[PDB]
Amino acid sequence: SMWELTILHTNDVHSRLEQTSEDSSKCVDASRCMGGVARLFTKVQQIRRAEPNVLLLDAGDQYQGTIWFTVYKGAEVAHFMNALRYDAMALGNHEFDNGVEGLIEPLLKEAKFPILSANIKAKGPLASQISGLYLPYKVLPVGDEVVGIVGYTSKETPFLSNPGTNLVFEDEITALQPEVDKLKTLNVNKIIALGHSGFEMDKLIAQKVRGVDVVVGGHSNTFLYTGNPPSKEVPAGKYPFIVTSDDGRKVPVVQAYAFGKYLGYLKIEFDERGNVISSHGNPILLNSSIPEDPSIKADINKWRIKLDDYSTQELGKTIVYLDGSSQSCRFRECNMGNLICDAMINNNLRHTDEMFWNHVSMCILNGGGIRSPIDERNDGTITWENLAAVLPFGGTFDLVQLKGSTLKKAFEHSVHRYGQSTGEFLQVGGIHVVYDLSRKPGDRVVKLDVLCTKCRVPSYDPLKMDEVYKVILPNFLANGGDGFQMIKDELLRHDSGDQDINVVSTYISKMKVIYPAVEGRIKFS
Amino acid sequence: SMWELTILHTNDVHSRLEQTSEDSSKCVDASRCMGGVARLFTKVQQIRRAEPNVLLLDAGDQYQGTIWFTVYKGAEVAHFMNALRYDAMALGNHEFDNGVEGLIEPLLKEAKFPILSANIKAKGPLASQISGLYLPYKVLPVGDEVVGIVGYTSKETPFLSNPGTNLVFEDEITALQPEVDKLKTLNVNKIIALGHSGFEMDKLIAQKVRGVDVVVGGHSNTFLYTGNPPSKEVPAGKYPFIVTSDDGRKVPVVQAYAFGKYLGYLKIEFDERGNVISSHGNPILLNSSIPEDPSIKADINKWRIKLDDYSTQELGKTIVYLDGSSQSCRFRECNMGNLICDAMINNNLRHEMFWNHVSMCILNGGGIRSPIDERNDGTITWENLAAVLPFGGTFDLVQLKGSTLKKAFEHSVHRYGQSTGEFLQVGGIHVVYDLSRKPGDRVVKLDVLCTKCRVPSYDPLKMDEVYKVILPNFLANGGDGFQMIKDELLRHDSGDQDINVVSTYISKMKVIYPAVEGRIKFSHH
Numbered sequence A: 001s002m003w004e005l006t007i008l009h010t011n012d013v014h015s016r017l018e019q020t021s022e023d024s025s026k027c028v029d030a031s032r033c034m035g036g037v038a039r040l041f042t043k044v045q046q047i048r049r050a051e052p053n054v055l056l057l058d059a060g061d062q063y064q065g066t067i068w069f070t071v072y073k074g075a076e077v078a079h080f081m082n083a084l085r086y087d088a089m090a091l092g093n094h095e096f097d098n099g100v101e102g103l104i105e106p107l108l109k110e111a112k113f114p115i116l117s118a119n120i121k122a123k124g125p126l127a128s129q130i131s132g133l134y135l136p137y138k139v140l141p142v143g144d145e146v147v148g149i150v151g152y153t154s155k156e157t158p159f160l161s162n163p164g165t166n167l168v169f170e171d172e173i174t175a176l177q178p179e180v181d182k183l184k185t186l187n188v189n190k191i192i193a194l195g196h197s198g199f200e201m202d203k204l205i206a207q208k209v210r211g212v213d214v215v216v217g218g219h220s221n222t223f224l225y226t227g228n229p230p231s232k233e234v235p236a237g238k239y240p241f242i243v244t245s246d247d248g249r250k251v252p253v254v255q256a257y258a259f260g261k262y263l264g265y266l267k268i269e270f271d272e273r274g275n276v277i278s279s280h281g282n283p284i285l286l287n288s289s290i291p292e293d294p295s296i297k298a299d300i301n302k303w304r305i306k307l308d309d310y311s312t313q314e315l316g317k318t319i320v321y322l323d324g325s326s327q328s329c330r331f332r333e334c335n336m337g338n339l340i341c342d343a344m345i346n347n348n349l350r351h352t353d354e355m356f357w358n359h360v361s362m363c364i365l366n367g368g369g370i371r372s373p374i375d376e377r378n379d380g381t382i383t384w385e386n387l388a389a390v391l392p393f394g395g396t397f398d399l400v401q402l403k404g405s406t407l408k409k410a411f412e413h414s415v416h417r418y419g420q421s422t423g424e425f426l427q428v429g430g431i432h433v434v435y436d437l438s439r440k441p442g443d444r445v446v447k448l449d450v451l452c453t454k455c456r457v458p459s460y461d462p463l464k465m466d467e468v469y470k471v472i473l474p475n476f477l478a479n480g481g482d483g484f485q486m487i488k489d490e491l492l493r494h495d496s497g498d499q500d501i502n503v504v505s506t507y508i509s510k511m512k513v514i515y516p517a518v519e520g521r522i523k524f525s
Numbered sequence B: 001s002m003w004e005l006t007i008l009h010t011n012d013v014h015s016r017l018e019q020t021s022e023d024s025s026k027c028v029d030a031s032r033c034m035g036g037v038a039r040l041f042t043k044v045q046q047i048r049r050a051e052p053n054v055l056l057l058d059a060g061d062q063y064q065g066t067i068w069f070t071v072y073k074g075a076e077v078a079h080f081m082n083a084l085r086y087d088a089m090a091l092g093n094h095e096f097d098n099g100v101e102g103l104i105e106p107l108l109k110e111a112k113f114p115i116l117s118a119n120i121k122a123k124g125p126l127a128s129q130i131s132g133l134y135l136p137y138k139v140l141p142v143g144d145e146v147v148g149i150v151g152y153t154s155k156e157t158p159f160l161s162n163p164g165t166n167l168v169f170e171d172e173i174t175a176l177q178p179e180v181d182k183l184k185t186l187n188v189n190k191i192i193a194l195g196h197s198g199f200e201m202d203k204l205i206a207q208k209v210r211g212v213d214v215v216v217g218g219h220s221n222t223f224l225y226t227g228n229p230p231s232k233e234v235p236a237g238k239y240p241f242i243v244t245s246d247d248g249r250k251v252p253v254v255q256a257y258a259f260g261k262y263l264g265y266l267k268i269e270f271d272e273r274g275n276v277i278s279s280h281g282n283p284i285l286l287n288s289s290i291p292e293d294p295s296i297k298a299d300i301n302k303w304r305i306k307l308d309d310y311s312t313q314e315l316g317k318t319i320v321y322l323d324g325s326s327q328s329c330r331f332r333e334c335n336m337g338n339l340i341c342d343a344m345i346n347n348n349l350r351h352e353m354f355w356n357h358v359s360m361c362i363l364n365g366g367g368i369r370s371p372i373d374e375r376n377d378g379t380i381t382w383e384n385l386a387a388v389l390p391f392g393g394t395f396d397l398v399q400l401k402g403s404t405l406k407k408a409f410e411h412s413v414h415r416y417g418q419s420t421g422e423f424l425q426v427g428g429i430h431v432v433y434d435l436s437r438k439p440g441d442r443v444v445k446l447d448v449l450c451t452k453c454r455v456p457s458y459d460p461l462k463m464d465e466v467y468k469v470i471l472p473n474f475l476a477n478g479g480d481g482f483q484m485i486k487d488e489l490l491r492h493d494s495g496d497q498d499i500n501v502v503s504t505y506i507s508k509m510k511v512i513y514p515a516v517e518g519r520i521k522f523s524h525h
């Protein structure tokens, strides 16, 4: 006997409730838009009507990304995941962005599906308060069988979000194995690991956690595909990606890029003892060929009414593509980063009363903080809604005084694990940096010139290790985020500045028409 | 028996009627201001009271440079040169900026001193109208002797000014020699060549024109000094500069920088036959240690009242020194050039579909005529801007082949080192020169902002591609020897008035801070 299971999966949807452009920015030309929950619902139902055994799983980071989340604060997540009848969700790092209070009340209490993480352990007064609102696993009836779904969440959540001091994030593999072993003693012979630690950790789970049949992941925005890919995303490997486990088995690993653009689809043939005989599938592109379900669409447009205040006023105009995509902004100089750094610098010089920062000419900005492009076609209008998707996190652009030695180490940290699509890669203003990636980690910065301070005419001069420099940067970086521990520990002064989104909108309003270029601020030799 | 003559001389005063800052920009801090006609008058009288034989000579380019000339149109030049009792002036190129009618009516008819040029010949109806209003020479009584003063004016005047089609500008050496020979047959044994063609031409006149005892020049802003110089100007050689003529004699050549900052002072010992036995002197720095003459200052203040409308409104603020000096803007990237090119680009995007993505700018360095100072709250008025951009040109739009553009960048540095105005300031262009290479093949790198691209980046210029550039009408019309532009351009549209563009930009930006960014570089070998 064989038993067939269809796994449908989303990850890193990031508040893209409505359909979007091809690059996940706002939908303008409806005929070429993609994703959104209403389209997803249609494709899910087509599969459900065709296959008997279907699970619809989310691998986390539903929270944060557009004005949907700014206004509704996770209540939209509960509502539309409930309407889609998700079977389970794993907690991502962004689910803790509004604290544990912003997780509990909006999402955990209102979800009609189990929410999972086996490596998150509650301590003190929070333990009884959150008890049973999330679970380490759920065992789900699927026709005549059961399927065990075990959850996990990135160990980096305390450095990326606001989980608070009364949660502990354990190692995934140490936390998962006892739960998986327990499930076997409970006669659960089919086990899916569902979680939010990235493709590299997903592969290690597949390899090391004995009993895991399939891994459904998130957090790295990993596109996997078998065959000719249907859009711009370049596959990192085949779908499914096959890990050869230490216990001698083939464990498929899946992810479905991000932003609800694709629906993950994996058909698994199990034997009677719960072992994978075979699996096949591919992410399904949610393009115009799949219609938006009318009922969901009507419900989305009902919730949309409150959001239209944010798209009323044109702040200004771009005449160039504002490339705020992760493929650009985490690997090389991107023009959206240049815009944000120039706005940071420009708006700080408005504050003429405060003398200590009134010539600040230097800027750093983590590429992973840039969260959407903006499109120039159809008259390139920029509203608050457009900006909210670029800069969703509600942080500030703060002022720090740093030694040149601290800054050189930050630029080394910027490319220490380069190639892995990590957020710590720095966009800059008033700095020209040259990297040589063939050199060893910690010695890749071959040139670092900065705008002078004690000079009448600003020019780019070599950074001196013993000099001191005034930089404008996100509070996330000032507070030691993205492993920038040298900044937090070595900084000499640190002042709070203005709110990030307000800074960029003011700049755009003043400039009216923007046209930021890639200029050679970051080069590679 | 020896006979001693003191030559006092100014050149390229360029409408600096009032005292100025050290760099010839507007006077703000009075205790460190310099020049102006009232201070000059004080120093002239001190010399005149002490030496019996004194001539005060001007070597041209009184016309053009500040709102004095905008408002009074040369009437200020006549009035204050008359008050100083100049003995003679040679016509410079800028004396023709308002046409021959702008020379005749304001200056030639109202000057109480001879105005000189021996290589300017009037033809047709103009000949009888201008007859005797300027002269090729004047023979001046000085004590019990006479001194011949023979005039000359740059051959380049028709390509730099508006002399009109009824003047011919002859070769200096060919035009001077017959007049100098004539003067000898009239028993004038002491001859000064006074003129406006530049230090290199001045040297050739000294060398080749037999009978010339001394050359007093202008037009190259050449600082000559013997000993330790008193201010920021680097001497190009000794004062006087000694030429060995073809007939073996030692001919002193003098110039006195520009802007009325210095008074040229040369003592000459003549024998009874009019040979130069010896000479010595130096330019005298007209700093605060010489008081402004009270009567001239009172008169200046009377004429000043009309001008104060131009200094009423603050257009905006700079927080950096705006280096618009010739020593910067004709030799390397200057930040005033970057400001003007960015203003040109920015203002054009306000408007017309064919030019609405123009990202490339070229600007002749010699068109930038003053710095602006950042100290004392760095205020920018119209008066400040009028000294930067005095010429009343427009910022025009051209379509050009890449081959035309590469040839322009070769012409930009073909005779580099001579302080010539054709050196180009740029926007949306990164140019690298190797000066060790031969003239016409110094451009080793030339990258430009792309047009048919979503994200603007700097890509190598293609010889066969076509490019859209914003530039002065002076360069569009083939000025500064940019003959390739006029002859090869594919379209040419008139744009906005130059000063209005820069003031609008400053008003929009409020606070400006242009840097030297690496738009123009020089390579090692």
Ligand SMILES: O=P(O)(O)[C@@](CO)(COCc1nnn[nH]1)OC[C@H]1O[C@@H](n2ncc3c(NC4CCCC4)nc(Cl)nc32)[C@H](O)[C@@H]1O
Pocket: A012, A014, A061, A093, A094, A097, A160, A161, A162, A219, A220, A221, A258, A326, A366, A367, A368, A369, A370, A371, A372, A393, A394, A395, A421, A422, A423, A424, A474, A476, A481, A482
């Ligand atoms: O799955 P995640 O966690 O979202 C993903 C993991 O690699 C993949 O995101 C792909 C993607 N999605 N959309 N665009 N890019 O990126 C995370 C990256 O985001 C940046 N970051 N993380 C947090 C954060 C922040 N503060 C928060 C603290 C409390 C709440 C707000 N402020 C800023 Cl300016 N930047 C921040 C970092 O550079 C980080 O490395």
Ligand SMILES: O=P(O)(O)[C@@](CO)(COCc1nnn[nH]1)OC[C@H]1O[C@@H](n2ncc3c(NC4CCCC4)nc(Cl)nc32)[C@H](O)[C@@H]1O
Pocket: B012, B014, B061, B093, B094, B097, B160, B161, B162, B219, B220, B221, B258, B326, B364, B365, B366, B367, B368, B369, B370, B391, B393, B419, B420, B421, B422, B472, B474, B479, B480
């Ligand atoms: O003694 P001159 O002639 O002024 C001096 C000779 O080398 C030395 O000037 C040192 C100095 N003085 N103050 N600052 N720099 O520079 C002349 C340089 O000036 C620029 N130029 N010349 C004319 C001109 C123009 N049109 C005119 C037509 C009617 C009147 C206006 N438009 C423009 Cl944008 N630029 C123009 C060129 O680059 C030229 O090469």
Ligand SMILES: *[C@@H]1O[C@H](CO)[C@@H](O[C@@H]2O[C@H](CO)[C@@H](O)[C@H](O)[C@H]2NC(C)=O)[C@H](O)[C@H]1NC(C)=O
Pocket: A230, A285, A287, A288, A289
């Ligand atoms: C929506 O996506 C599908 C999936 O990629 C596209 O369908 C493909 O179309 C091309 C021809 O244009 C064929 O070579 C493929 O075989 C099709 N794949 C299928 C049906 O799975 C479709 O073109 C997209 N819709 C658009 C562009 O409107």
Ligand SMILES: *[C@@H]1O[C@H](CO)[C@@H](O[C@@H]2O[C@H](CO)[C@@H](O)[C@H](O)[C@H]2NC(C)=O)[C@H](O)[C@H]1NC(C)=O
Pocket: B230, B285, B287, B288, B289
């Ligand atoms: C005005 O310029 C003169 C130079 O002509 C300055 O006088 C010189 O001052 C230094 C000391 O500061 C002496 O070593 C020189 O011997 C002086 N030279 C002459 C010719 O007097 C004078 O300081 C300047 N005035 C200022 C700065 O107000």
Ligand SMILES: [Ca+2]
Pocket: A189, A190, A191, A211, A212, A213, A273, A274, A275, A276
């Ligand atoms: Ca199994």
Ligand SMILES: [Ca+2]
Pocket: B189, B190, B191, B211, B212, B213, B273, B274, B275, B276
């Ligand atoms: Ca003689």
Ligand SMILES: [Zn+2]
Pocket: A012, A014, A061, A094, A219
């Ligand atoms: Zn995510």
Ligand SMILES: [Zn+2]
Pocket: A061, A092, A093, A094, A196, A218, A219
């Ligand atoms: Zn994540």
Ligand SMILES: [Zn+2]
Pocket: B012, B014, B061, B094, B219
């Ligand atoms: Zn001049």
Ligand SMILES: [Zn+2]
Pocket: B061, B092, B093, B094, B196, B218, B219
């Ligand atoms: Zn001149």
